[PDB]
Nucleic acid binder design. Structure first.
Lengths: 92, 119, 74, 176, 124, 96, 68, 186, 75
RNA sequence: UAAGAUAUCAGAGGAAAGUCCUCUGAUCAAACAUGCGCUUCCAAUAGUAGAAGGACGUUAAGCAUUUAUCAUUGAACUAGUUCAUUGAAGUCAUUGAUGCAAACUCCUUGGUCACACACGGCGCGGAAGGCGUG
RNA sequence: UUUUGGAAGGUCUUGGUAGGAACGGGUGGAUCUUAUAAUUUUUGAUUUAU
């Protein structure tokens, strides 16, 4: 699935979040796993009633993510190529 | 058995999907997915009026009704017509299927018979 | 490291009394001794009492369902 | 199976760690660095060739533009335009890498310069740069009087080459 | 407005500017680019549109004008759990004939790369 | 386990298990009461059911009540044939 | 030292109460049998949120705890 | 950006410029603490079971489950399958056609070509000792050769050596088919 | 499927938000594939820093269906 | 993460029950062609226009509203109010935020096609569907 | 004399014009069924409700 494979393409670039509690985190994304859970580094965190703070390191259960906003130059990374021609694999 | 495999045979029928919100969706049905992702065509999605001397209706669903971009400005009552609405399965509470069709032809699952006929 | 299923087990054998905060909707905290558990983190509580959030009735032997477990605390 | 489509190659021995040895491998990094450098310029270099919609001109405007004289156009040669596009492309590369940092040069001997401009050792960024000397301990005991044959004059203001001959020819006072 | 193909699933309508609804009553309107088994989707230049609490009395049953407060967020990856339904808004910038043309030239160009890579790997 | 093994298991849990209340209600033509997590109850006869507890019903009579500042009304909505998603239900009783 | 799955097997055809999470509603009757997912079946039940009921089935999600 | 903790060099890292921070918008849905499905679910009341009788008198006879009769057609047909098998199992010490000398002398031969004859059967099986009898079995309902025969040897050791040889040897080719051998079984 | 990699976090003081409103700070010992987590010397944070704050227990284990975020307030 | 599978149905045939395989029907689907007096849409030049969509643009500090911490101790005070001190947290904003409306400017889109200035079709396309055969 | 099908010639119209067939693999991707209704998406904690 491409939605998740894209998120790995965005390691070490600034991203946003929006947790289903209604917060908004935006800092550099260090790790991601296959369940769409992320570790952000050097973030700015906006509580649902507007209050903003800064925290150095944060982890979020992937289940609570509502969307992620990624840098706009990955819109043409090669996940999105329709007709791709892979070579013949090496024999195991 | 999967009773979602019953819905797949109910294709090109008039139907009313009725959602968890309270939003009813009267339309022409197309391919239902294995996770019950029903996909309709010539639709008309509305909210009923719970009367009781102006009890406030579903606040979230009224927003989601106008946002669809189907609600016409001079709709006096709360309705919204459009073509093609794809609906994620988990939101279906009920599906009011029509009176004409016979269940007895359709509730006979093929994989149910194909397990007994094979043994 | 100390895994949680490992550490739920160290309330079973030690016989320590625990308090278990539930889902915030319901509005009660349960407490008593955790006898035994399953793979799905649903546990049986021995000599249990239902405190609303110290006048709550005693329950007895209660199997608690693992959807409603928020905290398990000594 | 698994493969990295920047390199276009399949992994020989599939484990998790062989992936991570390929994902932070020197060959693979140079590809993915180079892949996005090509997609960067291609959105700019392939400029939007717009589609024209020609209207049938009026009887009125066709007479008012006929009395107006035809202006001369200038078309360069093929050899000329291949050079002038080599220049103008290399000029826009320069305006990327200007980064006018005179202001760091001005506060060089100030009392908090170690703590704000060195940037390995701020607070905001400082913990992040230590992962990937002029230390924070520096006070205003060392170098008490800046002007003791130490300081360099301020580098003069830059100027455009094209219009380098608009400058007044002589200075007002006699410099050394 | 736009008439979608009467039997067109979510796989077909790539590049169609969609109109996706979440559970909270917020709508993300943008060009679709991928989807998934559990229906999380990647929009390209989406805009979230919300009806504020103050405007919401105006939609209660009696031309209505609604101040929809929207904010740009380019290239999202939504989550499946949250989606409630989808609706189609616009059709793609390129034609139906022209989307076949760009496929066959790219299908030709993709095959040329492998044979030029295989013979550059074979001898050297 | 094998694919044939689960077919035996499914026939057991429908026949000799908690869902035997529904299965014995389908066969014997006995009407049921169902309570959805909607807080409104439907009085119906079952025509099929399934693993997930979803079920096709026939001659459905829904009974939904609403309140707004201690003012009550009891609404009744009749439907010919209905298909009910299975997560919505919490308690199925079988009428005498 | 009793685990949950064998705990239901002990409580077969005894008088139990099962508390749904919603309105502090226990269903008070005699258990019949159990599922893999702790779906329940009752006989001669009584609804305490007052009434005396016939034969009940309870879906798994909705249950809070099970008492004797 | 300044730091760029990424695999890429400083030029490529500055190339992925993010759109500026999201504007804040005051939320419209319910707060995550307050979120809940409808509580106060009034149970299946006695008053509800009192109002069952208005439904019960209206639809006293339920509709017939005719889709169930498609399953009651097949399962009862499988039981009737066993009874026709039960009619056969009561009917081998009788058949007359299997009731010559010792059953330890009898080879079964099977899969024999429809278009064999007893003389070619005799040739092959006489390879493993003197024959006392043959019989190919034919369908008594119309004399299609059934593809099996029973062959009584003068000694059971020659019957078991014929068995050895011409069945576990892939099946003896006779005419154009691969003929299992067994002992009598029956 | 995969275990969440909080290997760098363990033995540091960690604030985390339980469901909506409750915040619980403690020293993180162990974790599992569901993100149910266990920590030593817990303390429930509130609006008034010394007043409404009270300690929970010596060892407490949290279910991973109520973690939202988990910030590491140390190095 | 794994295993399995590559339309369904019915009939005849080959190795009493079922499986495996093959040609004959029905239904289902995809791709490709190809039709329908099929449906909808495709912008002034005989003029300085206009349609759809925007503006995260201006007028504009518009106009009309409502908002700017809590606890502890003393003085005065009516029978709540102000002043000073001690502690707790504290998105920024008040030229704001919320509601109402207009004007102007500017951006992206297209057949700015051919014939005709003529008292409820059957010009040549392109775009979007519906329906039908092969 | 007509309708239905097949063969050829003529005329109008429309599409294609460099790849296609068979066969083969411890080949790629899609879909489908089951493990899978047990906390990370789809078998319900967002109609704010007593």
């Amino acid at each position: 699935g491409i939605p998740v494979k894209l998120l790995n393409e965005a390691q070490g670039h600034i991203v946003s979040l929006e947790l289903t509690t209604g917060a908004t985190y935006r800092g550099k994304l260090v790790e991601s796993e296959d369940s769409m859970n992320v570790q952000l580094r050097d973030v700015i965190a906006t509580e649902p009633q507007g209050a903003v703070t800064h925290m150095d390191q944060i982890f979020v259960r992937g289940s609570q993510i509502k969307f992620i906003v990624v840098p706009d130059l990955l819109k043409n990374a090669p996940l999105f190529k329709k007709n791709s021609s892979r070579p013949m694999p090496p024999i195991r | 058995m999967k009773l979602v495999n019953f819905l797949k045979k109910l294709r090109n029928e008039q139907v009313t999907i009725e959602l968890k919100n309270g939003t009813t969706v009267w339309g022409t049905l197309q391919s239902v997915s294995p996770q019950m992702n029903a996909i309709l065509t010539d639709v008309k999605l509305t909210l009923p009026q719970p009367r009781l001397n102006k009890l406030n209706s579903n606040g979230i669903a009224m927003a989601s009704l106008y946002l669809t971009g189907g609600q016409q400005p001079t709709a006096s009552d709360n309705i919204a017509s459009l073509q093609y609405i794809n609906i994620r399965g988990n939101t279906i509470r009920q599906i009011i299927l029509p009176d004409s069709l016979n269940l007895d032809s359709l509730l006979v699952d093929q994989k149910q018979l194909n397990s007994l006929r094979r043994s | 490291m100390v895994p949680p299923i490992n550490c739920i087990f160290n309330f079973l054998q030690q016989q320590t009394p625990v308090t278990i905060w539930l889902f915030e909707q319901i509005g009660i905290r349960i407490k008593g001794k955790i006898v035994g558990f399953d793979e799905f983190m649903n546990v049986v509580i021995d000599e249990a009492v239902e405190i609303p959030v110290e006048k709550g009735t005693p329950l007895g032997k209660i199997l608690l369902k693992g959807d409603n477990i928020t905290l398990i605390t000594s | 199976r698994y493969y990295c489509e920047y390199c276009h190659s399949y992994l020989t021995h599939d484990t998790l760690s062989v992936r991570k040895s390929h994902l932070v491998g020197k060959n693979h990094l140079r590809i993915t660095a180079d892949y996005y450098r090509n997609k960067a310029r291609d959105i700019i270099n392939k400029h939007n060739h717009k589609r024209r919609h020609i209207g049938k001109r009026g009887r009125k405007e066709r007479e008012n533009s006929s009395q107006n004289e035809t202006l001369k156009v200038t078309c360069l040669s093929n050899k000329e335009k291949r050079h002038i596009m080599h220049v103008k492309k290399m000029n826009q590369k320069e305006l990327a890498q200007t980064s006018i940092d005179t202001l760091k040069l001005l506060y060089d001997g100030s009392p908090g310069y170690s703590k704000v401009f060195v940037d390995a050792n701020r607070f905001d960024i400082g913990d992040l740069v230590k992962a990937s000397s002029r230390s924070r301990d520096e006070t205003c005991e060392s170098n008490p009087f800046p002007r003791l044959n130490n300081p360099k004059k301020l580098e003069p203001p830059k100027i455009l080459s094209q219009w380098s001959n608009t400058i007044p020819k002589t200075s007002i006072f006699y410099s050394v | 407005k736009i008439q979608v193909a009467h039997s067109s699933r979510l796989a077909n309508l790539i590049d169609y500017k969609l109109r996706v609804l979440t559970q909270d009553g917020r709508v993300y309107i943008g060009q679709l680019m991928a989807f998934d088994k559990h229906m999380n989707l990647v929009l390209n230049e989406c805009i979230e549109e919300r009806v504020p609490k103050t405007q919401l009395d105006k939609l209660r049953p009696r031309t209505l004008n609604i101040k929809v407060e929207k904010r740009v967020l380019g290239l999202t990856i939504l989550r499946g759990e949250q989606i409630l339904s989808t609706v189609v808004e616009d059709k793609p910038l390129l034609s139906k004939k022209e989307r076949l043309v760009r496929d066959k030239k790219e299908k030709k160009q993709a095959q040329k790369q492998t044979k030029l890579r295989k013979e550059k790997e074979k001898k050297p | 386990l094998s694919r044939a093994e689960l077919e035996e298991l499914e026939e057991f849990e429908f026949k000799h298990g908690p869902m035997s209340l529904i299965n014995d209600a389908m066969v014997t033509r006995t009407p049921v009461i169902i309570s959805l997590r909607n807080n409104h109850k439907i009085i119906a006869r079952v025509k099929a059911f399934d693993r997930h507890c979803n079920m096709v019903l026939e001659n459905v009579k829904e009974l939904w009540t609403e309140k707004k500042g201690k003012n009550v009304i009891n609404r009744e909505r009749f439907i010919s044939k209905l298909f009910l998603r299975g997560d919505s239900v919490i308690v199925v009783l079988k009428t005498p | 030292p009793v685990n949950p799955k064998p705990f239901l097997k002990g409580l077969v055809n005894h008088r139990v109460g099962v508390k749904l999470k919603f309105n502090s509603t226990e269903y008070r009757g005699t258990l019949v049998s159990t599922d893999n997912y702790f779906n329940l079946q009752l006989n001669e039940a009584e609804e305490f949120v007052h009434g005396t009921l016939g034969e009940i089935f309870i879906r798994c999600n909705n249950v809070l705890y099970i008492r004797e | 950006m300044n730091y760029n903790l990424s695999k890429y060099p400083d030029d490529v890292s500055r190339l992925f410029k993010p759109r500026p921070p999201l504007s804040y918008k005051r939320p419209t849905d319910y707060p995550y603490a307050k979120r809940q499905t409808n509580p106060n679910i009034t149970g299946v009341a006695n008053l509800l079971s009192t109002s069952l009788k208005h439904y019960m008198e209206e639809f006293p006879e339920g509709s017939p489950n005719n889709h169930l009769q498609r399953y009651e057609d097949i399962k009862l047909s499988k039981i009737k399958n066993a009874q026709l098998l039960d009619r056969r199992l009561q009917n081998p010490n009788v058949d007359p056609h299997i009731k010559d000398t010792d059953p330890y002398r009898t080879i079964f031969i099977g899969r024999l070509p429809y278009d064999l004859d007893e003389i070619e059967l005799q040739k092959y099986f006489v390879k493993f000792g003197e024959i006392e009898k043959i019989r190919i079995v034919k369908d008594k309902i119309t004399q299609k050769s059934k593809g099996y025969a029973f062959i009584v040897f003068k000694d059971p050791i020659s019957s078991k050596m014929a068995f050895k040889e011409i069945g576990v040897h892939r099946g003896i080719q006779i005419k154009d088919r691969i003929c299992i051998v067994d002992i009598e079984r029956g | 499927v995969s275990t969440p990699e909080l290997k760098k976090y363990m033995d540091k003081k960690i604030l985390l938000n339980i469901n909506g409103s409750r915040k619980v700070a403690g020293i993180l010992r162990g974790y599992d594939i569901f993100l149910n987590v266990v920590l030593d010397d817990a303390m429930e944070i509130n609006g008034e820093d010394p007043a409404n704050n009270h300690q929970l227990g010596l060892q407490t284990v949290i279910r991973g269906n109520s973690i939202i975020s988990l910030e590491a307030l140390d190095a």
